[PDB]
Every structure is written in structure tokens, then in C-alpha cells.
């Protein structure tokens, strides 16, 4: 079993590097963030441009959807996060507290909390309703590259250029696990698997690893791509075959068989680093996006 991802749509409109793309949980929309300071919304199935959401004073590094698909949160170089009502375009809250670039963000499944990571080396947990910072975690000793909640929101995983992945108890703020791998290369991305049992981590030595995070055992290693500089997103694809998907600094999207670790497809089309990929929640659809020399977003579809 290999997939047959093929290019269907190219989405042009951002005027600087794209930073992040994410599908809405309801499957209807794709949200994109950029160094051009904008968020754009696009149809998930047809790539049709929907609207621009503006307000940040500097470039945006990440964007994330609430579980009901009504809200977005964005993370900016302006040291803030913003919560947006997507339909109205309204900025509902500006989350203030970080003392340097906010790099990454996510809602919990309940979507009453937001987690953020920053160049200030901290992770913050925020109340969606009030915009108040509830906890500041002294998480890392270098910039925080990614933050993600597990399936029931009881855990947060964080990654950092300090070379560590840490697991945090959402309720207490306590550090529960530090994952250590030899030579401590910068960790440029991390997230939980959809079931919550594993985490997938990227390091800046051209390597992705699937970890059992309780046992601290590395179960799989994925290689063949290029990643030595940029914080590139990676994914589990679960709508068809069970794949791992990532961008790459050679301008390709890589797809691996999760079990065997073989590369099953490489998607050609982008003309600069593929910084971000996302997998549609119900259909075999991948979105990908590229840095400044390209600036486009691509939608790819497979029969499996």
C-alpha cells in the first residue's frame, strides 16, 4: 500500500513566507498564517479564497483552530497571541505576557485553554474566556519550538532548541517527563499521536522519531528528508493508510509508512522550503506551504 497524492490546487495570496497551515476540525476550511502579518482562510476541498484576518503588528509564526471550528488563535513576533472569531473577523482577545516572539500555539480539546511557546523560553497556559495567563512554565533554556495538548487535554508536550521534549501536567503545571536523546540536537517540532500514546519529534539533524514518552523509548526513526535549519511541521495521516507526513528543506513533501519507515511518496511542486504540512481530518487531503521564494500553499489528494 502506497498513497497516490496528486496536486489539485495551488493557493496564492500571501506576500511573504507562509508559516503554518491547519485544517478546521469540521473539515471545511484551511487557515494559513504568514510573515506578511496576515491570516487567510480558504476552502479545504476546492482551495477557494475565503477571507483575510488582520491585526498583528509583526509576522505570525503559527495558527490553530478551536474544536468547534469557530475560533482561531495566532502566535506573533509582536509578543502576543490573538484569539479571532473566524466568521466575523473580530479580534476577541489579545494575550499579553510573553517577553519575546511567540512561536507556537494550540487549543486544548475542550477549547477553554490555549497553550503557547515563545523565544522567551517559556510555555504559557491561557484562559480562552478572559484572556488571562493562568500559568507560566519555566519550560526550557532556549526558544520553544512547539506545544500540543494530548487527546483529553490533561497533558502538554513542548519542544525546544535546548534539545529536550518535556511532558507537562495541564492542571498542576508540573514537569512529568524529560525525553533525552544522544547529542541533544535542537528539537524543531513535536506533537502527540491522535490516540495520545506517542509523540513525534523532529530534530535539526534530518531526523523524525516516534517516542513512547512514558517509557522514554524511541520506537521508529524516519529519515531521507532535509531538516537542519527550520522548524518544520510533521503529521500523522490516519484517514487512509497510516503515514507520517513532513515538509523538507529540499522543497518536497515527504510521506513515510509509519510501521516500516520506508518513504512511500515525495511530492514535487514547491520552489522553496516546505515549512508546514497538515492532514485533513476525514479525507485523504494534505496541505503544504513554503517560504519566501515560493509563498504558495498546495492541496494534494489521494485515493488512499
Ligand X SMILES: NC(=[NH2+])NCCC[C@H](N)C(=O)O
In the complex, minimum distance from the CB of residue 221 to ligand X, in angstroms, rounded to a whole number:
21
Binding piece for ligand X, criterion CB under 6 A, among 160-168, 215-223, 226-234, 254-262: 226-234
Q: How far apart are CA 243 and CA 236, in angstroms?
A: 6
Task: Give the single-character DSSP code of 3.
Answer: -
Binding of residue 187 to ligand X (CB under 6 A) = no
- 68 Cβ contact list (under 8 Å, min separation 6): 25, 26, 111
Residue 20 vs 296, nearer CB to ligand X: 20
Binding of residue 20 to ligand X (CB under 6 A) = yes
Q: Are 177 and 187 in contact (CB under 8 A)?
A: no
Residue 20 vs 235, nearer CB to ligand X: 20
Among 62, 120, 121, 294, binds ligand X (CB under 6 A): 62
| Residue whose C-alpha cell reads 477571507 in the numeric block | 51
Instruction: Please report the DSSP string for 235-285 in residue order.
Output: EEE-SSS-EEEE--TTS-EEEEETTT--EEEEE---SS-EEEEEE-SSSSE
Q: Mask of contacts with ligand X, 227-266, x by CB under 6 A? A: ---xx-x---------------------------------
In the complex, minimum distance from the CB of residue 249 to ligand X, in angstroms, rounded to a whole number:
11
| Cell triple for 49 | 479564497
Binding of residue 19 to ligand X (CB under 6 A) = yes
Binding of residue 104 to ligand X (CB under 6 A) = yes
Provide the binding-site residues for ligand X, judged by CB under 6 A.
17, 19-20, 61-62, 103-104, 230-231, 233, 275
Amino acid at each position: 500500500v502506497k498513497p497516490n497524492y496528486a496536486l489539485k490546487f495551488t493557493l496564492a495570496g500571501h506576500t511573504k513566507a507562509v508559516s503554518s497551515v491547519k485544517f478546521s476540525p469540521n473539515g471545511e476550511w484551511l487557515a494559513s498564517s504568514s510573515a506578511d502579518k496576515l491570516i487567510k482562510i480558504w476552502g479545504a476541498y476546492d482551495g477557494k479564497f475565503e477571507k483575510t484576518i488582520s491585526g498583528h503588528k509583526l509576522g505570525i509564526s503559527d495558527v490553530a483552530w478551536s474544536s468547534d471550528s469557530n475560533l482561531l488563535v495566532s502566535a506573533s513576533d509582536d509578543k502576543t497571541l490573538k484569539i479571532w472569531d473566524v466568521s466575523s473577523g473580530k479580534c476577541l482577545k489579545t494575550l499579553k505576557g510573553h517577553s519575546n516572539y511567540v512561536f507556537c500555539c494550540n487549543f486544548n480539546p475542550q477549547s477553554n485553554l490555549i497553550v503557547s511557546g515563545s523565544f522567551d523560553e517559556s510555555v504559557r497556559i491561557w484562559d480562552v474566556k478572559t484572556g488571562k495567563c493562568l500559568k507560566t512554565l519555566p519550560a526550557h533554556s532556549d526558544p520553544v519550538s512547539a506545544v500540543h495538548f494530548n487527546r483529553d487535554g490533561s497533558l502538554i508536550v513542548s519542544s525546544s532548541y535546548d534539545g529536550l521534549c518535556r511532558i507537562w501536567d495541564t492542571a498542576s503545571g508540573q514537569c512529568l517527563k524529560t525525553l533525552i536523546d544522544d547529542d541533544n540536537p535542537p528539537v524543531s517540532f513535536v506533537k502527540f499521536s491522535p490516540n495520545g500514546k506517542y509523540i513525534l519529534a523532529a530534530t535539526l539533524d534530518n531526523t523524525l522519531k516516534l517516542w513512547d514518552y512514558s517509557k522514554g523509548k524511541c520506537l521508529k526513526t524516519y529519515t531521507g528528508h532535509k531538516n537542519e535549519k527550520y522548524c518544520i511541521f510533521a503529521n500523522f495521516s490516519v484517514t487512509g493508510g497510516k503515514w507520517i507526513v513532513s515538509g523538507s528543506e529540499d522543497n518536497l513533501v515527504y510521506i513515510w509508512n509509519l510501521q516500516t519507515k520506508e518513504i512511500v511518496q515525495k511530492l514535487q511542486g514547491h520552489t522553496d522550503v516546505v515549512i508546514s504540512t497538515a492532514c485533513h481530518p476525514t479525507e485523504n487531503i494534505i496541505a503544504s506551504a513554503a517560504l519566501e521564494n515560493d509563498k504558495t500553499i498546495k492541496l494534494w489528494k489521494s485515493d488512499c
